[PDB]
Amino acid sequence: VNSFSGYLKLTDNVYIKNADIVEEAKKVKPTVVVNAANVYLKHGGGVAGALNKATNNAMQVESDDYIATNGPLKVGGSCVLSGHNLAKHCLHVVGPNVNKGEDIQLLKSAYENFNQHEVLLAPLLSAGIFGADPIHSLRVCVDTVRTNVYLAVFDKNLYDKLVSSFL
């Protein structure tokens, strides 16, 4: 039993809710919140910009030190950093950005990072400003993630379409 509330159950291990991931994280304080990161951990907009803003830019400060030490992530890769006031940890995961011409096949590799964590609060990878089809992202999530994932979808219209079209 966990404290995630109001989710629709899609499969044995995948749950979904129309919610602002920032507000969900502040309420639940999950062990892991997933950020929709880019390889430079520049949290300018989308989910990343919102999460970083909620940390009063502490996420960005920590991320800049991470990059200065380690260099950029790989597309499809991840790193674990602090969750600041939102969660114990933040798993920064880089899905492919279609608006950069990045290979959508890398979306499966991106979701594989979730399997290193027993329970996660997450957005749909490569959705929103990353330009991929969110219906496809949900399909890859369900077919790749085996750990318990609670998906927050900000847009109510999109949430309803994801549920109604789910096979």
Curated annotation (Swiss-Prot):
Topology of this chain in the membrane: Multi-pass membrane protein
Record text on activity regulation: Inhibited in vitro by GRL-0617.
Listed result of changing residue 31 to A: In strain: Mu/B.1.621
Catalytic activity of the protein: Thiol-dependent hydrolysis of ester, thioester, amide, peptide and isopeptide bonds formed by the C-terminal Gly of ubiquitin (a 76-residue protein attached to proteins as an intracellular targeting signal)
Domain Macro, chain residue ranges per copy: 1-167
Cellular compartment(s): Host endoplasmic reticulum membrane
Its job: Responsible for the cleavages located at the N-terminus of the replicase polyprotein. Participates together with nsp4 in the assembly of virally-induced cytoplasmic double-membrane vesicles necessary for viral replication. Antagonizes innate immune induction of type I interferon by blocking the phosphorylation, dimerization and subsequent nuclear translocation of host IRF3. Also prevents host NF-kappa-B signaling. In addition, PL-PRO possesses a deubiquitinating/deISGylating activity and processes both 'Lys-48'- and 'Lys-63'-linked polyubiquitin chains from cellular substrates.
Quaternary structure annotation from Swiss-Prot or TrEMBL: May form homohexamers. Interacts with N protein.
Record-given protein name: Papain-like protease nsp3
